[PDB]
């Protein structure tokens, strides 16, 4: 599913990222603009040979099973197949893992790059919320 930007303001809303760790929901609809494209099936290949998933891009490497990255971890607990459903529930629950972990949103390199210190309401103006 190729999300609109209110619609997927309108998700992260109800499933709790706004301000979730005091991340506006800017910052989220931000990062799966830049991620993403807002598309639910993105998927990238990294030069480590692990492979990022979802509307967040998250990584194999660490967050979920993809049965090809030796070596690495699940800490979502989940196929990153999941990570590509046109519900987003578990991208959700998986990046309130990843964001708590100490490194908040600058886990997301696009974030860091392209949202960090911008004016990130402007993703979400315009919005019925």
């Given at each position: 599913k190729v999300f609109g930007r209110c619609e997927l303001a309108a998700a992260m809303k109800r499933h709790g990222?706004?301000?979730?760790?005091?991340?506006?929901?800017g910052n989220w609809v931000c990062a799966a603009k830049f991620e993403?494209?807002?598309?639910?099936?993105a998927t990238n290949r990294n030069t480590d040979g692990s492979t990022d998933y979802g509307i967040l891009q998250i990584?194999?490497?660490?967050?979920?099973?993809?049965?090809?990255?030796?070596?690495?971890?699940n800490l979502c607990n989940?196929?990153?197949?999941?990570?590509?459903?046109?519900?987003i529930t578990a991208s959700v629950n998986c990046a309130k893992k990843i964001v708590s972990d100490g490194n908040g949103m600058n886990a997301w390199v696009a974030w860091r790059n392209r949202?960090?210190?911008?004016?990130?309401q402007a993703w979400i103006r315009g919005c019925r919320l």
């Open positions: 990222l706004d301000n979730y760790r005091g991340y506006s929901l993403s494209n807002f598309n639910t099936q990584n194999s490497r660490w967050w979920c099973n993809d049965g090809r990255t030796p070596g690495s971890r989940i196929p990153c197949s999941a990570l590509l459903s046109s519900d949202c960090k210190g911008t004016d990130v």
